Amino acid sequence: NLYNILKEVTENAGYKDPDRFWTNPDSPEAQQAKAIREQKEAQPKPEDIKAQADAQRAQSDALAKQAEAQMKQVEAQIRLAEIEL
Amino acid sequence: NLYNILKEVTENAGYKDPDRFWTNPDSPEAQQAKAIREQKEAQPKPEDIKAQADAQRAQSDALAKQAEAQMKQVEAQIRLAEIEL
């Protein structure tokens, strides 16, 4: 639609050929340019920092769960064995 | 397209030769200038800090997993032997 508007303005100005001043968005060069433009939004700045923060959150979950279970098992067997003797 | 517009304006102003005031974007010098301009977009600043944080907390996850496994092996092996004796 914008390309059509620009064509109409240019033709009314007095230039019959509109490709001299504008680029058709359906031309293969325009499609390629749109391809690179779309490819340039792979990932923003702090989102991968966000992902590695999620990784450290997961490791915190792990360490906490294993610490709790390990200390429970510590109470299970390191005391009663020396209690009975 | 911008080069064509500038050339048209210059010719209408009364100067037949447009290369005196503008340079053709298809000229080899323009291609070289575009080459250095693109090359100066190799890596922005914060992204390496991002990758550094990635590595640091992948480090955190690693040491978390090894710590959990090591403590599990300690509790399963350093205790029963001294319990039985």
- Distance (Å, whole) CA A6 – CA B1: 13
What CA–CA distance (Å, rounded) separates B60 from A60? 9
Q: Which of A74, A77, A67 is nearest to B67 (CA)?
A: A67
Phi and psi based region of residue A14 (left: phi greater than 0; alpha: psi -120 to 50; beta: remaining): left
Return the structure tokens found at A53.
Answer: 């923060």
Q: Cα–Cα distances in Å, from A23 out to B3, B21, B62, B79, B82? A: 13, 24, 53, 78, 83
Indicate yes or no: CB of B54 within 8 angstroms of CB of A56.
no
Query: Backbone phi, then psi, for A36, in 5-degree steps?
Result: -65, -40
Structure resolution in Å? 2.6
Residue A19's φ and ψ, nearest 5 degrees, are -75, -15
- Whether residue A20 lies within 8 A of chain B, CB to CB, comes out as yes
What residues of A are in contact with residue B57 (Cβ under 8 Å)?
A: 52-53, 55-56, 59
- Give the position of tokens 């100066």: B40
Structure-determination approach? cryo-EM
